Curated annotation (Swiss-Prot), chain A:
Cellular component aspect of the GO annotation: extracellular region; host cell cytoplasmic vesicle; host cell cytosol; host cell plasma membrane; host cell presynaptic membrane; membrane
Region (Translocation domain (TD)): 434-830
Source organism superkingdom: Bacteria
Residue sites binding Zn(2+) per the record: H224, Y228, E262
Residues the record marks as active site: Q225
Catalytic activity: Limited hydrolysis of proteins of the neuroexocytosis apparatus, synaptobrevins, SNAP25 or syntaxin. No detected action on small molecule substrates
Region named N-terminus of receptor binding domain (N-RBD): 831-1050
Gene from which this protein is expressed: botB
Protein name per Swiss-Prot or TrEMBL: Botulinum neurotoxin type B
Domain writeup: Botulinum neurotoxin A light chain: Has protease activity.
Organism in which the protein naturally occurs: Clostridium botulinum (strain Okra / Type B1)
Pfam families: Peptidase_M27, Toxin_R_bind_C, Toxin_R_bind_N, Toxin_trans
Length: 1253, 694
């Protein structure tokens, strides 16, 4: 339906796709531009937007245009035909990328179909007119002029490259695209100089490269502007109460008025800033405009300008555009449901956040988030950099995880930083009564109290037909996606028409303003404190001080907000012998000083960071005194720099009508109650909007300041280390081995963890402030209004007591107006993940799903299965080779990383217990030159060894007892995790810490970058090891995280056997009871019951080994009962209905139970397969225990559809242990926590190659 | 430490708390008592010189604040990163017992100094006497000598354990004894502080009794005080448990970081002797090759790792007694955990939490499988169920929560559901309008009624209400969402009664999994329980009831939850499509689910079946030309679909064929066909379906 054309700037004019356009703003002043029709009704003019701007404004000066962007100027840009062609091809590529997905195709289709109405406010309703600057545009055909219809015109960037904009045509101070009619909309755009942002509000754990800055995708910016184009075309770019910033104080950011359209377009929490009253006002204005449009359509009879126009075709087109409805007679009418859906989709469906989520792009979290300087993209036409399908985040280039393609630190080859010479910013010079310059974008944003509507104070007239109107600022994007049609073609009229004659139009005028404002203030706040932590590049020998004044006095002194011990250590000077140790200790102390929190349990908040006040001194002198005590005593209001006035209007009283018709007087009371509920939510929405636009912004600024302060501290420490290293002599430097990349990575990880803690604390503080100091004030007046409404309703009823035969109504009112509508914040709101080598199964082969593109080579000697289990044997070709990207590796210096997997080791050969005890064989190796880590297995132990460059060895192992009667680790799957940090190396088994060692003596470990899975050593030919779910993390894992991962990896739909493998149908099994681990079942010699005997034990040769036989007793088998599901899969699933048969001689007998028994217990009835009315033969398999386990329970049921439980199979004893069914167990399983030692717990043991007599 | 402990006891009934030990001991009047409760004393000093307590409202507020401050102070902990994981240190352990109380925070010293610093007698180890007999000699072949050497190797390994065990016993006798003594001294301070607070409360209540207040209010205040005493006892027990865990972990890590290295060092100086003796004996044997001797020496030599027996988990399981296991088994957070079983015409409903609540129910009640088990079914009008327990009296300072599953089969006039009200005090739940209402009222007139909407009939709902009086926070969840987070700071004593009544009042209802907890719950707990309860291998309709075969249903797509698919004839073929916006009045198509085992009634996950559509008894087939789902009048040609569902979308199911999920398709000239999709451009939410009872 939508086609992207191809051409070049030098193609000859054909007057069909390449034309000599006359832009509307020319005002009949000639100056045609070569225009290209990329798509139907869409044109591109690769030229600079010089309409309104003076030519001298293109060069940078001391002035500025906008006070919230880092402007960039380049007059030479777009000065040669070649540059024009590059711009045109980039536009083509961006449009193709947009159309590559259904959502973009739908947006483009709506733009194309949304042709402007053929008129405006200055036209009689009963006729069309095209001689308007907002409808037709002129073109030159001569080598005189004709007119053509257009929707969108895209120009090149104006004086400011990184400031894209969309412009609508206004005439006589009236805009036709704000009044339902619509008009031609222009754009100024540049795909090269995109903006940069940060994700301080988003937590991704202790990620090295997180919060390093991201650059936007030009396609997303283009779609963002196209949303404005769509809104303008559909005539819903209406103006209402703007969000005016407050500029009374000095620390408050200044900005131009913000309309609701921008916040709606952005999406997320932004629409919550618009009060529901303003939402309703905009909705009503749009509805009135649409009513005017439909009246015009119904009253149209003829056309004047171009008689060749087919009026019926255009009427049908407009009907399709506005979703009107044609009656049987022919009249056009508005359907409320269709109009509501259209409005919600246009305003809340097409949003930047939704588009980014659909296209898998990263973007600003909120409209009020801070903005960084822009960057220049090296080349957007290189498919190795920017692909249409995946954009920057190319999966093939290992750039899909965490939007790595957009990260400034990762994709350093895809952009160039802008020179500060050309950047122009609006700065405030604060001088103490010496003078510090601060970018205006770094100040607090506080909306003035005049930005919020007080329409809640107006009286409401309630009638029988009154309806509750509630606009939900949301729309399911999936519904919009599924509404797109990618087959049906368009049937638009011809774009050509009569030439334009009327050129009256209002061209905007722009003027620069000074970029510097000087003010005087004697207050030392966030800005002054932040400045004190910066030093000139010239200074090299700096020193940390805890005195803010001292830091502000001497350039060589840098303020700090950490413990005095850290300050003393940072300044310490040591000989080269202890230099590496000193660096390690100071880096660890930096990571520890940050990461400091105190638990909070008296606030509904979890943790508090104590050093914010020292860092920033924000609010009522937070630095002085104990910050924690001040917080506990005065709430979170201490942190705020400005307590804002709260607007709480007095809800106007209702004025009900007097309808004599009981029915039409009783509906009025219910309408009043519904309207009251509406007023309640309107009040909640107003309070939330005020909180978001006055309080939360300050907290976000505090978070940004803390991030900046932490970065300043890290930079100062790095500079100090560099200076001290340079002080040392050449020989000492040669002796010393230090990698600054490791220092930077560790500092960034510490900063990220600290920022996570700060983010959680600040979010808790803001939410608590909203719930405690804002809502109750509104609720008080809401209760007052409720009482007033109750009084009004009662006299209304009394005045109509003669009518409406009323006690029920009085009771209903008294009951309803006693309750309060709860406040729901979610209405207005919206794995470890530090993994680098997640190995998984794709198709008869292993791959790395971490997203770093590790190269995996699997040899023919390895057996794999769908259960992600792979087996290593003694064959030379049973080997796996993993090559890791050099960029993504574990820290060599501080050595913080973890390794997790599931393992299964066979049982020691009975005769070969000497080789078992003495021979150690490696199973995993990551060694390059005798340095690295490896995992080996000496019989009865699992050793993890670590060797440094010098040759120092540190080992941590885990030994599972081999004397146990029934071992839980011998040859059953179990979960191994190994964790290493700068100091200690720990080993956990099945989520429980099992051992640790001190590795303080380790010097340095070099990563081999080549992991080999292979059994190496003096192993026997029969050796074989099973492994599963191998993964590596680049951080030290906590006990809770390990336990959670163990639980997650242990969950499966199916059931597990004794070894831990899936339980299968039609597979011979032996039964093992957890409560009687030493007992087995043997069919009675005479009676048809199973006697319980005692398991045998090893008594052959050695006192050093002891175990109990397992392959004894009757061989059981599970048979599918109904055979309903497909026979392809034989795995047994929980709650399945089964027959528990067993092989006796050559026959297959079945386990039954007595239909009626008096006593609690009753011996089972083992007998051949048959059908009878005296026994139940249906068994359900259940797993009551929530924690991981290989046990299961068996329950007897009268029938599949019956809800009567018979009892649980088990063993009891009066000696004479018996294999029975008990009704008592039915209760014991429910007594939390589940008792794993109960007699109803069962396990199945199939013959396995890993267990021998 | 004993002096500090004795400073916390007193005989006078009009004493006063103080934090200066020297001031307390120097007190001639003996009117002072030493206490480390900072918050309680600060609060007491704050109200000092204020209006006297005369009204029961003031007394309730005073008691609530005292209880809150005492609990915050006693249970205070600070988490620190130790080599042995993370330890929850007790902040106040320094001020009590005068340990590491020199200056600054106690945690700060405890971090910059090992846990060994707590005890006053360190370095008590002593090296045991070691007798390592040397290998005796007669020659023998490598085949026989190998077994001899292996036996000697095993014997030496065993001796190296005997020594490890001796060192462990030394640690237990000399080091763990001091930590257990510290534990005993610490739990004595907690009881002393509890006694002090109780005496303060009793003195204040006695003073109030000599006022102009009605006898009924005074009795209510006395009962509230009695309940607050149990609450304080629970808080003190929590503090005792924290102290126990913290000090036990400290002792274990002391062994790890202060004794094991010395044992390793001592044996490192003994493995050399064994190795030398073995080498000498091997060299003294003649009938063996030199390479054989080298290999044997390489085999029979001990490295450090050969005598490392430390197992942190074994130590933890070694200091755990049967009493600890019994306490863990007997520890429960439920004051009522309903258990219902139908048996064989012997329906049993009872509490299994161990609190033995007396349940009185009429024989008219029934039991049905509601969500994941038998559910009380109140059908006949005027049916009542009552649960009796003293703990249900609630009071002033006690946090609890109700949790259950509800299904209303009636309409929507007002109707009581659950209540524990005595005239005015207590809490209530009742249907009102098209939703529920939760009301809590104190004996002083303060009320708090919340309306929870979207409780329309014929739907399963999961109600979870929590009252946490430590934060004065009220949390109400429905399904898996947070509806209310109100504050109850103005809600005083709600002492109501010992029994809560459950009634129907003309509205039939299923009630399942009723549970009463003696503590507040978290959002994570509610979400986990809600999603784990529904993970039962059963596929449910949109209502929430079990999906069953041969029942007439209507099919909806999750993306469009108001559009029912209908049949459309195109190109002499019948396909299922979505109703257009204009023609949204056509009656939706009705479906039926068939199965190979026609006896089976209730659908289960992974079940394979045939979809039956109702005149000619149509069946579902998958077109091989356009991949759309068409209808064929023959069960032989119909496909065998597999039914499943997503865990996090419990009431919506998924169809599968050849491992391909059936799903909707993009718009096609006012149609949205049902297809067997493979493209990735269709949102993953489009292959989730819902069946509604017709």
């Amino acid at each position: 339906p939508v086609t992207i054309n191809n051409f070049n700037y030098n193609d000859p004019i054909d007057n069909n796709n390449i034309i000599m356009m006359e832009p509307p703003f020319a005002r009949g002043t000639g100056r045609y531009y070569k225009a290209f029709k990329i798509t139907d009704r869409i044109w591109i003019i690769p030229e600079r937007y010089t309409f309104g701007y003076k030519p001298e404004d293109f060069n940078k000066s001391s002035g500025i245009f906008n006070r919230d962007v880092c402007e960039y100027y380049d007059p030479d840009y777009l000065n040669t035909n070649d540059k024009k062609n590059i711009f045109l091809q980039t536009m083509i590529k961006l449009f193709n990328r947009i159309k590559s997905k259904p959502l973009g195709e739908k947006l483009l289709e709506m733009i194309i179909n949304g042709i402007p109405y053929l008129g405006d406010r200055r036209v009689p309703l009963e006729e069309f007119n095209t001689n308007i600057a907002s409808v037709t545009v002129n073109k030159l055909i001569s080598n005189r002029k004709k007119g053509i219809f257009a929707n969108l015109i895209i120009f090149g960037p104006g004086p400011v490259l990184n400031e894209n904009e969309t412009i609508d045509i206004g005439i006589q101070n009236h805009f036709a695209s704000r009044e339902g009619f619509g008009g031609i909309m222009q754009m100024k755009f540049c795909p090269e100089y995109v903006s940069v942002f940060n994700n301080v509000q988003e937590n991704k754990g202790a990620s090295i490269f997180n919060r390093r800055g991201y650059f936007s995708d030009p396609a997303l910016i283009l779609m963002h502007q196209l949303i404005y184009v769509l809104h303008g075309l559909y005539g819903i770019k209406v103006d209402d109460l703007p969000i005016v910033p407050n500029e009374k104080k000095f620390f408050m950011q200044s900005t131009d008025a913000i309309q609701a359209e921008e916040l709606y377009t952005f999406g997320g929490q932004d629409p919550s800033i618009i009060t529901p009253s303003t939402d309703k006002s905009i909705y009503d204005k749009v509805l009135q405009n649409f009513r005017g449009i439909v009246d015009r359509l119904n009253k149209v009879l003829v056309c004047i300008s171009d008689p060749n126009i087919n009026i019926n075709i255009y009427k049908n087109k407009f009907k399709d555009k506005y979703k009107f409805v044609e009656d049987s007679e022919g009249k056009y009418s508005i359907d409320v449901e269709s109009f509501d859906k259209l409005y919600k989709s246009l305003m809340f469906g097409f949003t930047e956040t939704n588009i980014a989520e659909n296209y898998k792009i990263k973007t600003r979290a909120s409209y009020f988030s801070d903005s960084l300087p822009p960057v220049k993209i090296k080349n957007l036409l290189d498919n190795e950099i920017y692909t249409i399908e995946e954009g920057f985040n190319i999966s093939d280039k290992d750039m899909e995880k965490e939007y790595r393609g957009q990260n400034k630190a990762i994709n350093k080859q895809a952009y160039e930083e802008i020179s500060k010479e050309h950047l122009a910013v609006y700065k405030i010079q604060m001088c103490k009564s010496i003078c510090i310059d601060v970018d205006n974008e770094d100040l607090f944003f506080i909306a003035d109290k005049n930005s919020f509507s007080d329409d809640l104070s107006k009286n409401e007239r309630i009638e029988y037909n009154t309806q509750s109107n509630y606009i939900e600022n949301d729309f399911p994007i999936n519904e919009l996606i599924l509404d797109t049609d990618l087959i049906s073609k368009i049937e638009l009229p011809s774009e050509n028409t009569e030439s334009l004659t009327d050129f009256n139009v209002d061209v905007p005028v722009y003027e620069k303003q000074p970029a510097i404002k000087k003010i005087f203030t004697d207050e030392n706040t966030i800005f002054q404190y932040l400045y004190s932590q910066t030093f000139p590049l010239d200074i090299r020998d700096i020193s940390l001080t805890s005195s803010f004044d001292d830091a502000l006095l001497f350039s060589n002194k840098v303020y700090s907000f950490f413990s005095m011990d850290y300050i003393k250590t940072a300044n310490k000077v040591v000989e080269a012998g202890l230099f590496a140790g000193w660096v390690k200790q100071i880096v660890n102390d930096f990571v520890i000083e940050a990461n400091k929190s105190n638990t909070m349990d008296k606030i509904a908040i979890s943790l508090i960071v104590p050093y914010i006040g020292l860092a920033l001194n924000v609010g009522n002198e937070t630095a002085k005194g104990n910050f924690e005590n001040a917080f506990e005593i005065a709430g979170a209001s201490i942190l705020l720099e400005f307590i804002p006035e709260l607007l709480i209007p007095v809800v106007g009283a209702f004025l009900l009508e007097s309808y004599d018709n009981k029915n039409k007087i009783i509906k009025t009371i219910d309408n009043a109650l519904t309207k009251r509920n509406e007023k309640w939510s309107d009040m909640y929405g107003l309070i939330v909007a005020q909180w978001l636009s006055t309080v939360n912004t300050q907290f976000y600024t505090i978070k940004e300041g803390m991030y900046k302060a932490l970065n300043y501290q890290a930079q100062a420490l790095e500079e100090i280390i560099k200076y001290r290293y340079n002080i040392y002599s050449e020989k000492e430097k040669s002796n010393i081995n230090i990698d600054f990349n490791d220092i930077n990575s560790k500092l960034n990880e510490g900063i990220n963890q600290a920022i996570d803690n700060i983010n959680n604390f600040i979010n808790g503080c803001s939410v608590s402030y909203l719930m405690k100091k804002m809502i109750p004030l509104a609720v008080e007046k809401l209760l007052d209004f409720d009482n007033t409404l109750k009084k009004n309703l009662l006299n209304y009823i009394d005045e109509n007591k003669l009518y409406l035969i009323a006690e029920y109504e009085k009771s209903k009112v008294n009951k309803y107006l006693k309750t309060i509508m709860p406040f729901d914040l979610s209405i207005y709101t919206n794995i470890l993940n530090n993994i680098i080598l997640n190995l998984r199964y794709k198709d008869n082969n292993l791959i790395d799903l971490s997203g770093y593109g590790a190269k995996v080579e699997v040899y023919d000697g390895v057996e794999l299965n769908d259960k992600n289990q792979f087996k290593l044997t003694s064959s030379a070709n049973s080997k796996i080779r993993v090559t890791q990207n050099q960029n993504i590796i574990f820290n060599s210096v501080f050595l913080d990383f973890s390794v997790s997997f599931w393992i299964r080791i066979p049982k020691y050969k009975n005769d070969g217990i000497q080789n078992y005890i003495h021979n150690e064989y490696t199973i995993i190796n990551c060694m390059k030159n005798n340095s690295g880590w490896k995992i080996s297995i000496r019989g009865n132990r699992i050793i993890w060894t670590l060797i440094d460059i010098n040759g120092k060895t540190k080992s941590v192992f885990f030994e599972y007892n081999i004397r146990e009667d029934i071992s839980e680790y011998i040859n059953r799957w179990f979960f191994v995790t190994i964790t290493n940090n700068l100091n200690n190396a720990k080993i956990y088994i099945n989520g429980k810490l099992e051992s640790n060692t001190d590795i303080k003596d380790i010097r340095e470990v070099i990563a081999n970058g080549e992991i080999i899975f292979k059994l190496d050593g003096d192993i026997d030919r029969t050796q074989f090891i099973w492994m599963k779910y191998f993964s590596i993390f680049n951080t030290e894992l906590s006990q809770s995280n390990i336990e959670e991962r163990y639980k997650i990896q242990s969950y499966s739909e199916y059931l597990k056997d004794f070894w831990g493998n899936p339980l299968m149908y039609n597979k011979e099994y032996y039964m093992f009871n957890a409560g009687n681990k030493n007992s087995y079942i043997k069919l009675k010699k005479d009676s048809p019951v199973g006697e319980i005997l005692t398991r045998s034990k090893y008594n052959q040769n050695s006192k050093y080994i002891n175990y109990r036989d397992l392959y004894i007793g009757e061989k059981f088998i599970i048979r599918r009962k109904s055979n309903s599901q497909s026979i392809n899969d034989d795995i047994v699933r929980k709650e399945d209905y089964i027959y528990l048969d067993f092989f006796n001689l050559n026959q297959e007998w079945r386990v039954y139970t007595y239909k009626y028994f008096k006593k609690e217990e009753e011996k089972l009835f083992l007998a051949p397969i048959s059908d009878s009315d005296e026994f139940y033969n249906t068994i359900q398999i259940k797993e009551y225990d929530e924690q991981p386990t290989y046990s299961c329970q068996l329950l007897f049921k009268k029938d599949e559809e019956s809800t009567d439980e018979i009892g649980l199979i088990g063993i009891h004893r009066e000696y004479k242990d018996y294999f029975c069914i008990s009704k008592w167990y039915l209760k014991e399983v429910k007594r939390k926590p589940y008792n794993l030692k109960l007699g109803c717990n069962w396990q199945f043991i199939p013959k396995d190659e890993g267990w021998t007599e | 430490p004993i002096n500090y402990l004795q400073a916390q006891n007193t005989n006078n009934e009009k004493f006063s708390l103080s934090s200066d030990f020297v001031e307390v001991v120097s007190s001639k009047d003996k009117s002072l008592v030493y206490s480390f409760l900072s918050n309680v004393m600060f609060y007491l000093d704050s109200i000092k010189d204020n209006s006297p307590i005369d009204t029961d409202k003031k007394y309730y507020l005073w008691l609530r604040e005292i209880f809150r401050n005492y609990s915050f102070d006693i249970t205070a902990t600070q988490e620190i990163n130790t080599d042995c994981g993370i330890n929850k240190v007790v902040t106040w352990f320094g001020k009590a017992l005068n340990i590491l109380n020199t200056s600054d925070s106690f945690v700060e010293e405890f971090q910059n100094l090992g846990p060994i610093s707590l005890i006053n007698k360190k370095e008590n180890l002593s090296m045991p006497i070691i007798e390592i007999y040397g290998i005796p000699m007669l020659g023998l072949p490598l085949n026989d000598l190998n077994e001899k050497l292996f036996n000697i190797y095993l014997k030496n390994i065993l001796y190296f354990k005997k020594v490890y065990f001796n060192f462990l016993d030394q640690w237990w006798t000399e080091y763990y004894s001091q930590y257990f003594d510290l534990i005993c001294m610490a739990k004595q301070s907690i009881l002393a502080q509890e006694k002090l607070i109780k005496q303060i409360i009793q003195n204040k209540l006695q003073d109030l009794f000599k006022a102009d207040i009605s006898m009924d209010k005074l009795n209510l205040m006395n009962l509230a005080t009695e309940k607050t005493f149990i609450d304080l006892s629970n808080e003190s027990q929590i503090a005792i448990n924290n102290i126990n865990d913290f000090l036990n972990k400290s002792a274990i890590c002391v062994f790890d970081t202060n004794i094991y290295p010395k044992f390793i060092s001592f044996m490192e100086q003994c493995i050399n002797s064994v190795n030398s003796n073995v080498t000498a004996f091997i060299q003294k044997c003649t009938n063996i090759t030199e390479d054989e001797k080298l290999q044997l020496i390489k085999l029979n030599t001990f490295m450090n790792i050969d005598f490392e027996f430390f197992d942190i988990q074994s130590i933890k399981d070694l200091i755990t007694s049967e009493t600890d296991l019994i306490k863990e088994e007997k520890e429960s957070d439920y004051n009522l955990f309903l258990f219902t079983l139908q048996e064989d015409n012997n329906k049993v409903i009872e509490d299994i939490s161990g609190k033995n609540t007396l349940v009185k129910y009429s024989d008219s009640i029934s039991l049905v499988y509601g969500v994941n088990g038998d559910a009380l079914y109140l059908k006949e009008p005027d049916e009542s169920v009552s649960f009796s327990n003293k703990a249900f009296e609630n009071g002033l300072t006690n946090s609890f929560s109700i949790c259950f599953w509800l299904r209303n089969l009636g309409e929507i006039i007002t109707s009581k559901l659950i209540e524990n009200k005595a005239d005015n005090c207590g809490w209530e739940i009742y249907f009102e309008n098209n939703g529920l209402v939760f009301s809590i009222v104190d004996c002083n007139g303060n009320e708090e009624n919340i309306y929870l909407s979207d409780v329309i009939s014929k739907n399963w709902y999961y109600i979870s209400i929590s009252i946490d009086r430590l934060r004065n926070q009220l949390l109400i969840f429905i399904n898996d969402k947070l509806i209310a987070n109100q504050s109850i700071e103005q809600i005083l004593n709600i002492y109501s009664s010992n029994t809560i009544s459950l009634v129907n009042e003309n509205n039939p209802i299923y009630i399942e999994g009723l549970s009463i907890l003696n503590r507040s719950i978290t959002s994570e707990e509610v979400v986990n329980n809600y999603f784990s309860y529904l993970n039962n291998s059963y596929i449910r309709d949109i209502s929430g009831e079990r999906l069953e075969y041969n029942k007439t249903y209507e099919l909806y797509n999750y993306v469009f939850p108001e559009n029912s698919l209908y049949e459309v004839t195109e190109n002499n073929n019948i396909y299922l499509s979505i109703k257009d916006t204009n023609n949204l009045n056509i009656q939706g198509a009705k479906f039926k689910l068939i199965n190979i085992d026609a006896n089976k009634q209730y659908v289960q996950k992974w079940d394979e079946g045939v979809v039956c559509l109702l005149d000619e008894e149509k069946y579902v087939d998958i077109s091989s030309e356009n991949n759309r789902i068409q209808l064929v009048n023959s069960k032989d040609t119909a496909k065998r679909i597999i039914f499943n569902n997503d865990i996090f979308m419990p009431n919506c199911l998924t169809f599968a064929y050849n491992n391909k999920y059936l799903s909707l398709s993009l718009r096609d000239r006012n149609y949205n066909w049902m297809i067997c999709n493979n493209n990735d451009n269709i949102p993953k939410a489009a292959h989730l379906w819902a069946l509604k009872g017709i």
